[PDB]
């Protein structure tokens, strides 16, 4: 922009992956699983003779499993260590993930709503004991979706493995005393799902194995759409079941759980820990939403991330949300169910917008110390780092 394409960076601090690069890179120009680990024990046998490395981060940690003590010191995809993060940061600065230095430079990142920020502040003070940028930017995680297109209304919605979010929005204001999120995604769903598999005799040790569901969950998994007709079909036909080679070799045999594990989203009482699930929460959300907003929201609500590049569930949701409406609220009027125009709201760009959602601000903001928060405003003991 007003200076080089280097020396400013954008990064998704995501829970499945970190996705990162110089600000306005084509993609998040490096992507890696959010993984770390440093050596322990796996083999029980005389093999390997490796020499080459000890500790690992992310894309180089992948092969190793228990050859590393792997960790994610976490609750809600929000960390509870300071230091392995550092060794990751220290790694990332190489062509490793970035090829950068930081004092000379500036960066764009994100913050949880109700981040207990005293810990961000301590980290930031360490960043400004270390990486020490000439300027910085941070904003509430969901807000950065509305940026490639300059958007203002709806609910702002996210998921993946670690967490889910549900931000009610109008004229760009999220409605804060009114706001929602859900504190999980595919992680503990994989705990529940793998509990099903023990019962099949797939009693396999999790410690080496849980993240196998991840392979297929990432490479291969889906949702249907017909889904109540699909329940009817599934036991009556039986032959609609599936299987796959665990790539050590083993074909293991797998029913609807492939995308019936999603039913715990809409009926958390699946896991006996009760729930009407997110689709009832959504009804409640739009019951709280006012006349105009709820009516606009028939085609005016917003979605994010690779976790939204998802077949059939959108179709099943509107199939579903014609209902509770008609049922509870129209209480039997019907004549407008399509006349409530309905057009879909999750496009191919939801792939790259994990970082490209952020990047379209830097495209108008790198020259703006109107925007840049600073190392100076930390050094001040200033009440926050920001203009």
């Amino acid at each position: 922009m007003d200076s080089q394409g280097r020396k400013v960076v954008v990064c998704d601090n995501g829970t499945g992956f970190v996705k990162c690069g110089y600000a306005g890179s084509n993609f998040p120009e490096h992507i890696f699983p959010a993984l770390v680990g440093r050596p322990i024990i796996r083999s029980t046998t005389k093999v390997g003779n490796i020499e080459i490395k000890d500790l690992m981060v992310g894309d180089e940690a992948s092969e190793l499993r228990s050859m590393l003590e792997v960790n994610y010191p976490m609750e809600n995809g929000i960390v509870r260590n300071w230091d392995d993060m550092k060794h990751l940061w220290d790694y990332t600065f190489g062509p490793e993930k970035l090829n950068i230095d930081t004092r000379n430079c500036k960066i764009l990142l994100t913050e949880p709503p109700m981040n207990p920020t005293k810990n961000r502040e301590k980290i930031v003070e360490v960043m400004f004991e270390t990486y020490q940028f000439s300027g910085v930017y941070v904003a509430i995680q969901a807000v950065l979706t509305l940026y490639a297109q300059g958007l203002l209304t709806g609910v702002v919605v996210d998921s993946g493995d670690g967490v889910t979010h549900i931000c009610p929005v109008y004229e760009g204001f999220s409605l804060p005393h009114l706001t929602r999120r859900l504190d999980i995604a595919g992680r503990d769903i994989t705990r529940y799902l793998i509990k099903l598999l023990l019962l099949r005799g797939y009693a396999f040790n999790h410690s080496a194995d849980f993240e196998t569901v991840r392979m297929i969950k990432e490479k291969l998994c889906y949702v249907g759409y017909n889904i109540e007709q699909e329940q009817k079909l599934a036991l009556e036909t039986t032959v609609l079941v599936e299987s796959y080679t665990l790539p050590d070799g083993r074909i293991i045999k797998v029913g609807g759980e492939r995308f019936e594990a999603p039913e715990a989203l809409f009926q958390p009482h699946l896991i006996n820990v009760e729930g009407v699930g997110v689709a009832e929460l959504l009804f409640n959300t739009i019951q709280a939403a006012d006349i105009d907003t709820r009516s606009e929201f028939y085609k005016h609500i917003v979605l994010s991330g690779g976790s939204t590049m998802y077949p059939g569930l959108p179709s099943r949701l509107e199939r579903e949300l014609k209902q509770l409406y008609l049922e509870r609220v129209l209480k039997g009027d019907v004549e407008k169910l399509s006349k409530f125009k309905i057009r879909i709201e999750d496009p191919p760009r939801r792939k790259h917008m994990v970082f490209l959602g952020g990047a379209v601000l830097a495209d108008i903001m790198k020259d703006k110390d109107n925007f840049w928060m600073t190392r100076q405003e930390y050094q001040e003991k200033g009440v926050r780092v920001l203009e």
């Binding site: 509990k195 019962l199 036991l235």
Partner: protein
């Protein structure tokens, strides 16, 4: 409540079966689940196929005495990768019922037992059998722990008055744990513990190589148990404990005597260290399961961490036990004391916040303590099935008609459930 005759229990164990009779107060029987058939494979002479005509061509015997039968392979319709001989289990049980028990299953009622991890087909094909072969008036196949529920109200003094607490269960092919609150539970928080007494007793067959001799290598395992159970225990440190046996007389260094059954004449043989050395697998499920080792204490913690907060006072107030493998002497006391110290240690992390405030709100603490844990489970199981409440909600033959014959190809669960 009856057909012509009332309910009774069989607990259909994957080592020994157990049962008793209407009016008694114990399992009258706890018995080998075993049966002997010649499988010496010289399939020859005078050939014939495709004709189920009157036979001269069967050679078979069932029960504990089938263990003596030569060339007859004494198989076990216990469940152990062998499962398929649920085919034979019918004919076997037809012997048991009509010929050992010498009884009538169309006149009595019944309660029978299954594991948690059961698949449908092996039971449900036997349901036509239950109501067309055995043609029972009514029965149900309950998960095995359902019988133990009755013992927890056979114990019935003041405070026996809710379904919140925790059973710990242990056995020979299986061990179990379960987060019951008023009957409800959570999948991955119930625990299905595969580590069990088979897995110990062959390890003990290797301990023979420490000290002692003179046995048929399958009377070897017999003798190993016939020692084990009366004499084995736990020590606080190995390296103290060596020296008692090294030194301090027969209170440590006992001796045992028996028979070399190679031709039924004596052996007199050592005891010692092998007593305290045997049991330690509770603290060490790596012995069976070095692939997923986790000890008693950590496995308890791995449940409680789910079981949220407001329940943990009740957990304090209401831990509970199950099976002969949980009547044991001071291993549990040793464990309990240390597992108590472990929750105390895990709790005092909280001194971070309010500092040295250091005090518990008065909770409560008690657990089950009796030999009666062995004998009650048929008696209470038969009483359970005999409650008038049982007979309509257990599957009557028409409950079965409206569960099997009317259903699988005609809305199995209407699909999956829809």
């Amino acid at each position: 409540m009856a057909g012509r005759l009332p309910a009774c229990v069989v607990d259909c164990g994957t080592g020994y079966t157990k049962l008793g009779y209407a009016g008694n107060t114990e399992p009258q029987f706890i018995i080998p689940s075993c049966i002997a058939i010649k499988e010496s494979a010289k399939v020859g002479d005078q050939a014939q196929r495709r004709v189920m005509k009157g036979v001269d061509d069967l050679d078979f015997f069932i029960g504990d005495e089938a263990i003596e039968k030569p060339t007859y392979a004494t198989k076990w319709p216990i469940r152990h990768g062998i499962v398929e001989d649920w085919d034979l289990m019918e004919r076997f049980m037809e012997q048991v019922i009509f010929k050992y028990l010498r009884a009538e299953p169309e006149d009595h009622y019944f309660l029978l037992t299954e594991p948690p991890l059961n698949t449908p087909e092996n039971r449900e094909y036997t349901a036509e059998i239950m109501f067309e072969s055995f043609n029972v008036p009514g029965l149900y196949i309950a998960v095995q722990a359902v019988l133990a529920l009755a013992a927890s109200w056979t114990s019935r003094q003041v405070g026996e008055r809710t379904l919140t607490g925790t059973v710990i269960d242990s056995g020979d092919g299986v061990t179990h744990v379960i987060p019951v609150a008023e009957g409800y539970v959570i999948g991955s928080c119930i625990k299905h513990i595969p580590i069990a007494g088979r897995d110990i007793t062959y390890f003990i067959q290797q301990l023979l190589r420490d000290r002692e001799v003179g046995i048929p290598p399958e009377q070897s395992l017999e003798t190993a148990k016939a020692v084990k159970e009366r004499y084995s225990y736990v020590c606080p440190d190995l390296v103290k404990e060596f020296n008692k046996y090294d030194t301090d007389g027969s209170k440590w260094i006992k001796q045992y005597t028996g028979i070399n059954a190679i031709s039924k004449k004596e052996f007199s043989i050592d005891v010692g260290y092998e007593r305290f050395l045997g049991p330690e697998i509770f603290f060490h499920p790596e012995f069976a399961n070095p692939d997923f080792t986790q000890p008693i204490s950590e496995v308890v913690d791995e449940v409680i961490q789910n079981c949220p907060i407001d329940v943990r006072r009740p957990l304090y107030k209401n831990i509970v036990l199950s099976g002969g493998s949980t009547m044991f002497r001071d291993f549990g006391r040793r464990l309990q004391r240390d597992l108590k110290r472990t929750v105390d240690a895990r709790l005092k992390l909280s001194e971070e916040l309010s500092g040295g405030r250091l005090k518990p709100k008065p909770i409560d603490v008690q657990v089950i303590t009796h030999h009666m844990q062995r004998y009650a489970v048929w008696f209470g199981g038969s009483m359970l099935a005999s409650t008038p409440e049982f007979y309509q909600v257990c599957h009557t033959k028409k409950d079965y008609e409206e569960i099997g014959p009317s259903i699988c190809r005609h809305n199995p669960v209407f699909g999956v459930m829809s």
